[PDB]
Structure 1
Amino acid sequence: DEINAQSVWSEEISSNYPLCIKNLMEGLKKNHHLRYYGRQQLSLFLKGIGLSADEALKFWSEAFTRNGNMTMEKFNKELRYSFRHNYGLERINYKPWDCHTILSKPRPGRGDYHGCPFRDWSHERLSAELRSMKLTQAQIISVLDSCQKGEYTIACTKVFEMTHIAHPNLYFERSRQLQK
Structure 2
Amino acid sequence: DDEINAQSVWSEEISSNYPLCIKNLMEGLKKNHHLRFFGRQQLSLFLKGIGLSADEALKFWSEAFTRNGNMTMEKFNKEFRFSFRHNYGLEGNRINYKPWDCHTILSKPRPGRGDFHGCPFRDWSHERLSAELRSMKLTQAQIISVLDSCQKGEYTIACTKVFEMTHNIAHPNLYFERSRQLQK
TM norm. shorter chain > 0.5: yes
Per the shorter chain, which TM-score range?
over 0.9
Secondary structure in structure 2 of the residue aligned to 1:139? helix
Deviations 1:138-169 (A, max 9, x none): 00000000000000000000000100000000
Secondary structure in structure 2 of the residue aligned to 1:179? coil
Matches within 5 A, 1:93-172: 93-164=96-167, 165-172=169-176
Q: CA deviation at 1:37?
A: 0.2
Secondary structure in structure 1 of the residue aligned to 2:90? coil
RMSD: 0.4
1:73 and 1:157 map into 2 onto residues whose CA distance is 42
1:82 and 1:39 map into 2 onto residues whose CA distance is 10
Q: CA deviation at 1:93?
A: 1.8
Q: CA deviation at 1:53?
A: 0.3
> Who is 1:2 aligned against?
3
Deviations 1:20-59 (A, max 9, x none): 0000000000000000000000000000000000000000
Deviations 1:67-106 (A, max 9, x none): 0000000000000000000000011120000000000000
1:155 and 1:94 map into 2 onto residues whose CA distance is 27
Which 5+ residue runs of structure 1 have no aligned equivalent? none
Q: Number of paired residues?
A: 180
TM-score (norm 2): 0.97
Which 5+ residue runs of structure 2 have no aligned equivalent? none
Secondary structure in structure 1 of the residue aligned to 2:182? helix
2:153 and 2:164 map into 1 onto residues whose CA distance is 18
1:8 and 1:143 map into 2 onto residues whose CA distance is 27
Question: Runs of 4 or more off by more than 6 Å in structure 1?
Answer: none
